[PDB]
Write an enzyme that holds these catalytic residues in place. Sequence first.
Site, PDB file in Angstrom:
ATOM      1  N   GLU A  83      -2.262 -11.350 -11.284  1.00 47.95           N
ATOM      2  CA  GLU A  83      -3.227 -11.295 -10.152  1.00 47.95           C
ATOM      3  C   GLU A  83      -4.656 -11.589 -10.618  1.00 47.95           C
ATOM      4  O   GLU A  83      -5.459 -11.926  -9.760  1.00 47.95           O
ATOM      5  CB  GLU A  83      -3.188  -9.946  -9.445  1.00 47.95           C
ATOM      6  CG  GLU A  83      -1.804  -9.583  -8.957  1.00 47.95           C
ATOM      7  CD  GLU A  83      -1.791  -8.533  -7.863  1.00 47.95           C
ATOM      8  OE1 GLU A  83      -0.863  -7.675  -7.908  1.00 47.95           O
ATOM      9  OE2 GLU A  83      -2.711  -8.582  -6.977  1.00 47.95           O
TER      10      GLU A  83
ATOM     11  N   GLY B 259     -11.724  -3.533  -4.349  1.00 44.94           N
ATOM     12  CA  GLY B 259     -10.414  -3.659  -3.697  1.00 44.94           C
ATOM     13  C   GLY B 259      -9.934  -2.315  -3.206  1.00 44.94           C
ATOM     14  O   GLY B 259      -8.958  -1.778  -3.753  1.00 44.94           O
TER      15      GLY B 259
ATOM     16  N   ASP C 178       3.574   5.681  -5.459  1.00 43.95           N
ATOM     17  CA  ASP C 178       3.568   5.750  -6.942  1.00 43.95           C
ATOM     18  C   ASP C 178       2.710   6.954  -7.338  1.00 43.95           C
ATOM     19  O   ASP C 178       1.461   6.807  -7.400  1.00 43.95           O
ATOM     20  CB  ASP C 178       3.057   4.436  -7.546  1.00 43.95           C
ATOM     21  CG  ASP C 178       3.131   4.363  -9.061  1.00 43.95           C
ATOM     22  OD1 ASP C 178       3.252   5.437  -9.711  1.00 43.95           O
ATOM     23  OD2 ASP C 178       3.051   3.238  -9.580  1.00 43.95           O
TER      24      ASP C 178
ATOM     25  N   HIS D 160       0.854  -1.213   0.000  1.00 43.35           N
ATOM     26  CA  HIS D 160       0.000   0.000   0.000  1.00 43.35           C
ATOM     27  C   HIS D 160       0.880   1.250   0.000  1.00 43.35           C
ATOM     28  O   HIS D 160       0.548   2.195  -0.738  1.00 43.35           O
ATOM     29  CB  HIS D 160      -0.964  -0.083   1.172  1.00 43.35           C
ATOM     30  CG  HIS D 160      -1.861  -1.258   1.031  1.00 43.35           C
ATOM     31  ND1 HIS D 160      -2.908  -1.260   0.139  1.00 43.35           N
ATOM     32  CD2 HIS D 160      -1.845  -2.468   1.632  1.00 43.35           C
ATOM     33  CE1 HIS D 160      -3.545  -2.413   0.228  1.00 43.35           C
ATOM     34  NE2 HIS D 160      -2.902  -3.188   1.131  1.00 43.35           N
TER      35      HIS D 160
ATOM     36  N   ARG E 185       0.606   6.809 -10.682  1.00 48.35           N
ATOM     37  CA  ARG E 185      -0.597   5.931 -10.551  1.00 48.35           C
ATOM     38  C   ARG E 185      -1.669   6.647  -9.726  1.00 48.35           C
ATOM     39  O   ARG E 185      -2.854   6.720 -10.161  1.00 48.35           O
ATOM     40  CB  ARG E 185      -0.235   4.622  -9.840  1.00 48.35           C
ATOM     41  CG  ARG E 185      -1.421   3.737  -9.476  1.00 48.35           C
ATOM     42  CD  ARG E 185      -1.021   2.701  -8.432  1.00 48.35           C
ATOM     43  NE  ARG E 185      -1.269   3.299  -7.145  1.00 48.35           N
ATOM     44  CZ  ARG E 185      -2.300   3.025  -6.376  1.00 48.35           C
ATOM     45  NH1 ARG E 185      -3.144   2.072  -6.710  1.00 48.35           N
ATOM     46  NH2 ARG E 185      -2.468   3.680  -5.247  1.00 48.35           N
TER      47      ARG E 185
ATOM     48  N   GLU F  83     -13.132  -4.738   0.142  1.00 45.92           N
ATOM     49  CA  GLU F  83     -11.732  -5.144   0.354  1.00 45.92           C
ATOM     50  C   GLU F  83     -11.720  -6.500   1.052  1.00 45.92           C
ATOM     51  O   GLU F  83     -12.292  -6.591   2.165  1.00 45.92           O
ATOM     52  CB  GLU F  83     -11.022  -4.101   1.205  1.00 45.92           C
ATOM     53  CG  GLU F  83      -9.663  -4.574   1.656  1.00 45.92           C
ATOM     54  CD  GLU F  83      -8.775  -4.999   0.498  1.00 45.92           C
ATOM     55  OE1 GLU F  83      -8.686  -4.205  -0.469  1.00 45.92           O
ATOM     56  OE2 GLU F  83      -8.204  -6.114   0.551  1.00 45.92           O
TER      57      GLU F  83
ATOM     58  N   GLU G 278     -16.938 -10.763  -5.117  1.00 45.31           N
ATOM     59  CA  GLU G 278     -17.746 -11.868  -5.697  1.00 45.31           C
ATOM     60  C   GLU G 278     -18.908 -12.239  -4.762  1.00 45.31           C
ATOM     61  O   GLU G 278     -19.935 -12.674  -5.295  1.00 45.31           O
ATOM     62  CB  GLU G 278     -16.888 -13.099  -5.976  1.00 45.31           C
ATOM     63  CG  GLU G 278     -15.903 -12.911  -7.121  1.00 45.31           C
ATOM     64  CD  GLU G 278     -14.587 -12.244  -6.757  1.00 45.31           C
ATOM     65  OE1 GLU G 278     -14.413 -11.893  -5.574  1.00 45.31           O
ATOM     66  OE2 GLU G 278     -13.751 -12.060  -7.660  1.00 45.31           O
TER      67      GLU G 278
HETATM   68  C1  LIG Z   1      -3.158  -5.240  -8.313  1.00 43.40           C
HETATM   69  C2  LIG Z   1      -2.661  -3.906  -7.745  1.00 43.40           C
HETATM   70  N1  LIG Z   1      -3.159  -2.839  -8.580  1.00 43.40           N
HETATM   71  C3  LIG Z   1      -1.141  -3.777  -7.660  1.00 43.40           C
HETATM   72  O1  LIG Z   1      -0.544  -2.946  -8.347  1.00 43.40           O
HETATM   73  N2  LIG Z   1      -0.574  -4.633  -6.832  1.00 43.40           N
HETATM   74  C4  LIG Z   1       0.712  -4.638  -6.462  1.00 43.40           C
HETATM   75  C5  LIG Z   1       1.325  -3.423  -6.203  1.00 43.40           C
HETATM   76  C6  LIG Z   1       2.631  -3.373  -5.741  1.00 43.40           C
HETATM   77  C7  LIG Z   1       3.318  -4.542  -5.529  1.00 43.40           C
HETATM   78  N3  LIG Z   1       4.545  -4.737  -5.104  1.00 43.40           N
HETATM   79  N4  LIG Z   1       4.774  -5.947  -5.016  1.00 43.40           N
HETATM   80  C8  LIG Z   1       3.764  -6.722  -5.399  1.00 43.40           C
HETATM   81  C9  LIG Z   1       3.748  -8.157  -5.314  1.00 43.40           C
HETATM   82  C10 LIG Z   1       4.803  -8.814  -4.652  1.00 43.40           C
HETATM   83  C11 LIG Z   1       4.843 -10.209  -4.463  1.00 43.40           C
HETATM   84  C12 LIG Z   1       3.779 -11.004  -4.900  1.00 43.40           C
HETATM   85  C13 LIG Z   1       2.716 -10.370  -5.528  1.00 43.40           C
HETATM   86  S1  LIG Z   1       1.325 -11.302  -6.049  1.00 43.40           S
HETATM   87  O2  LIG Z   1       1.570 -12.755  -6.241  1.00 43.40           O
HETATM   88  O3  LIG Z   1       0.755 -10.670  -7.301  1.00 43.40           O
HETATM   89  N5  LIG Z   1       0.362 -11.176  -4.665  1.00 43.40           N
HETATM   90  C14 LIG Z   1      -0.487  -9.967  -4.581  1.00 43.40           C
HETATM   91  C15 LIG Z   1       0.404 -12.224  -3.616  1.00 43.40           C
HETATM   92  C16 LIG Z   1       2.683  -8.973  -5.702  1.00 43.40           C
HETATM   93  C17 LIG Z   1       2.741  -5.793  -5.741  1.00 43.40           C
HETATM   94  C18 LIG Z   1       1.421  -5.834  -6.212  1.00 43.40           C
HETATM   95  N1  LIG Z   2     -11.939 -10.097  -5.431  1.00 43.52           N
HETATM   96  C1  LIG Z   2     -11.560  -9.130  -4.600  1.00 43.52           C
HETATM   97  N2  LIG Z   2     -12.471  -8.599  -3.745  1.00 43.52           N
HETATM   98  C2  LIG Z   2     -12.078  -7.612  -2.928  1.00 43.52           C
HETATM   99  N3  LIG Z   2     -10.870  -7.074  -2.786  1.00 43.52           N
HETATM  100  C3  LIG Z   2      -9.992  -7.618  -3.647  1.00 43.52           C
HETATM  101  C4  LIG Z   2     -10.251  -8.618  -4.563  1.00 43.52           C
HETATM  102  N4  LIG Z   2      -9.111  -8.919  -5.293  1.00 43.52           N
HETATM  103  C5  LIG Z   2      -8.196  -8.125  -4.796  1.00 43.52           C
HETATM  104  N5  LIG Z   2      -8.660  -7.319  -3.785  1.00 43.52           N
HETATM  105  C6  LIG Z   2      -7.937  -6.269  -3.073  1.00 43.52           C
HETATM  106  O1  LIG Z   2      -7.808  -5.235  -4.009  1.00 43.52           O
HETATM  107  C7  LIG Z   2      -6.727  -4.374  -3.635  1.00 43.52           C
HETATM  108  C8  LIG Z   2      -6.032  -4.005  -4.921  1.00 43.52           C
HETATM  109  S1  LIG Z   2      -4.511  -3.095  -4.758  1.00 43.52           S
HETATM  110  C9  LIG Z   2      -4.888  -1.661  -3.760  1.00 43.52           C
HETATM  111  C10 LIG Z   2      -5.832  -0.781  -4.416  1.00 43.52           C
HETATM  112  C11 LIG Z   2      -6.203   0.431  -3.556  1.00 43.52           C
HETATM  113  N6  LIG Z   2      -7.612   0.802  -3.845  1.00 43.52           N
HETATM  114  C12 LIG Z   2      -5.276   1.592  -3.942  1.00 43.52           C
HETATM  115  O2  LIG Z   2      -5.420   2.033  -5.086  1.00 43.52           O
HETATM  116  O3  LIG Z   2      -4.384   2.084  -3.223  1.00 43.52           O
HETATM  117  C13 LIG Z   2      -5.921  -5.151  -2.591  1.00 43.52           C
HETATM  118  O4  LIG Z   2      -6.070  -4.528  -1.320  1.00 43.52           O
HETATM  119  C14 LIG Z   2      -6.514  -6.566  -2.627  1.00 43.52           C
HETATM  120  O5  LIG Z   2      -6.477  -7.192  -1.367  1.00 43.52           O
END
Ligand SMILES: C[C@H](N)C(=O)Nc1ccc2n[nH]c(-c3cccc(S(=O)(=O)N(C)C)c3)c2c1
Ligand SMILES: Nc1ncnc2c1ncn2[C@@H]1O[C@H](CSCC[C@H](N)C(=O)O)[C@@H](O)[C@H]1O
Lengths: 334, 335
Positions: free
Chosen positions: B127, B53, B26, B20, B29, B75, B104
């Site tokens: 993801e 999310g 970022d 986060h 973003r 979330e 969902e």
């Molecule tokens: C979807 C969202 N918008 C996003 O940007 N997510 C981010 C943002 C920053 C991240 N820094 N590292 C990771 C990361 C590091 C290790 C493993 C994974 S994972 O396999 O995809 N997982 C979530 C368990 C993700 C990030 C994911």
């Molecule tokens: N199916 C789902 N239902 C609810 N939350 C979900 C989800 N799949 C992913 N997420 C959540 O979605 C978030 C996406 S990343 C963080 C996004 C945040 N709104 C920001 O912009 O700073 C994560 O916190 C992850 O736990």
Amino acid sequence: TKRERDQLYYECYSDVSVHEEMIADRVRTDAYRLGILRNWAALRGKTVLDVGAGTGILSIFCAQAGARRVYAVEASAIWQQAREVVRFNGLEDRVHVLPGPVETVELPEQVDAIVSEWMGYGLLHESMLSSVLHARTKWLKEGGLLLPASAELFIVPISDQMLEWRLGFWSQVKQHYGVDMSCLEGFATRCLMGHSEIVVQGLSGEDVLARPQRFAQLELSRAGLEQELEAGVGGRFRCSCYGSAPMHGFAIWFQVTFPGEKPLVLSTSPFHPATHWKQALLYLNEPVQVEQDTDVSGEITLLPSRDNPRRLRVLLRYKVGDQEEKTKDFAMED
Amino acid sequence: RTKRERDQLYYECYSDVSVHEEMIADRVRTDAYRLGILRNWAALRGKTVLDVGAGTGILSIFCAQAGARRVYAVEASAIWQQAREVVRFNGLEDRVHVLPGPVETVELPEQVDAIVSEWMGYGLLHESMLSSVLHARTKWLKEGGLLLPASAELFIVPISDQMLEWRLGFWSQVKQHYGVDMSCLEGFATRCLMGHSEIVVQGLSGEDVLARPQRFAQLELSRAGLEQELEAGVGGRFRCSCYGSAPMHGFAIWFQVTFPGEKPLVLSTSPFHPATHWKQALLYLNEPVQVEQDTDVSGEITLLPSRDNPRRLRVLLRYKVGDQEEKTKDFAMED
Ligand SMILES: C[C@H](N)C(=O)Nc1ccc2n[nH]c(-c3cccc(S(=O)(=O)N(C)C)c3)c2c1
Ligand SMILES: Nc1ncnc2c1ncn2[C@@H]1O[C@H](CSCC[C@H](N)C(=O)O)[C@@H](O)[C@H]1O
Ligand SMILES: C[C@H](N)C(=O)Nc1ccc2n[nH]c(-c3cccc(S(=O)(=O)N(C)C)c3)c2c1
Ligand SMILES: Nc1ncnc2c1ncn2[C@@H]1O[C@H](CSCC[C@H](N)C(=O)O)[C@@H](O)[C@H]1O
């Protein structure tokens, strides 16, 4: 299981990246080159065991100092790259790569000298020193040379600049994005400081809040050392803070000493040039504010984890000023 | 490897501060969404929003600030507790409602006029979160409802990774620093750094780019059979012409997403644009290929979920470099 743990451990060293990292570490690699070339008198015409030869570079430094024969023992698949490097430098006749653990390998003779770069994070992570000491007992002649010959461990209270910015980040959201998230400082502190993992992170001299204290000296020649290592090594420390700082916990680091000319010291101090070891950080559960002359004392033991004997464990006891004595039990991160 | 096990490991990443911090730090973003939300005040003022999310809740708070009357902050990770506190502390707990659990399965009291979501992963679709946003669109967005962002585009270009070039050349430089020739280890380093089948997340710049980037897919989030496309795999053919002599290491892919306006706001992860946490997703060949000015490079790329972990990006690549025969390589996102 042992079989699984070894295979997984040696997998790391069968890949190029850690050897690139180690040889790109000029402080580390120059220290061994100069430690070896300065011991030319003791090596010239003599036999050397390189414990964990990796890509073979230290065995080749021993050949270049004029050792008659060098046994390069390497338990990981990287032994094939060591053989190729030795053949490629025309030293097949003087450096013999022996695949497998140093514990079970068969040298044709006992050796005049051991060279090894066995040091892990926090000095003792990976517990490689046991293999060096096993080799010393079994393959080093009475009186033979150990490179390096000793190690020292240091501790000091730190304020980690990078951790401070990460903790303070949530208070700066409002100025950047017009949302106040300063209320997540507590959460960020639990996530970043409340874990029990040793954190490998490079600090600077400005992060150091007192005179560093040596808490242990390991003389590799000292009979008793294998048993000391499994009991755990360490001791008490005491120091006085220089000024106002948010104290985040402690850094430990080490140096090793080659015999000389004069003795060469390889340091991983934050006051000295960066190495791939950085320092090993022991974070308190939360910051504690300290002041000029605040007394920080405690006691530290480094010992192998019960379930993985290559996994460094640190038992810390500490007192910051008039705050009560606290305890924290750390394990090396994955 | 059960669904409940895969979920709790995935959401445990998001229940920790580090991700986060990275996302909110970022600026590109986070500014894109602030601006993209506030620019859309008209369609949001007095309207209902779903934040898919919500994480620490930041985008849900941008929407309330844009004049939304009611925002549902869904979330699934334990970070919903931190969002509830952030909403409370910004005095918005009557307008922004944090609902725990997967989008969902959660209960809104009503359909919504807008969905906002930052669903994008490495290579866009790592993801597989777009699937959850589309589930929520189908189930909770009113007819003619608003989606932020609205579209995504995927791009591909041959690259000569200057950083990888340094790392492969490293073994030739050992003799100069230390007096030991390790130039014979280049092959070994190539096998280790290029011979694997992992997608590597890494920041490139223009100096790494060997041709005009080609768009290979456009995802209109409003389009009917998009979920089915995601399951089958999205992608397409590409062709380009190299700029000059260079050791080609493989391909970089990246994405942009578009908000409706003012002009439409484009959030880009291109190596020609300012750096984001997404960087670019690198697809290395097993070994370098020497290209020349106008060397033709073409193939076909599909992005789809992996079989074992449906949240893990898989890339099927078919490519041809000049008169070398067509080759194939099958990549999965690094862990
Ligand atoms: C979807 C969202 N918008 C996003 O940007 N997510 C981010 C943002 C920053 C991240 N820094 N590292 C990771 C990361 C590091 C290790 C493993 C994974 S994972 O396999 O995809 N997982 C979530 C368990 C993700 C990030 C994911
Ligand atoms: N199916 C789902 N239902 C609810 N939350 C979900 C989800 N799949 C992913 N997420 C959540 O979605 C978030 C996406 S990343 C963080 C996004 C945040 N709104 C920001 O912009 O700073 C994560 O916190 C992850 O736990
Ligand atoms: C002992 C020797 N002298 C040394 O410095 N070894 C190094 C040198 C560089 C390293 N870069 N990363 C690592 C590293 C990274 C992750 C995990 C581990 S591990 O669990 O201790 N393992 C070896 C599998 C180690 C290095 C180890
Ligand atoms: N018990 C053991 N027997 C043999 N080799 C071992 C060993 N324990 C660790 N090693 C090896 O020791 C090496 C330590 S890293 C140092 C490599 C090389 N001497 C250099 O300085 O660059 C690794 O290659 C590891 O696989």
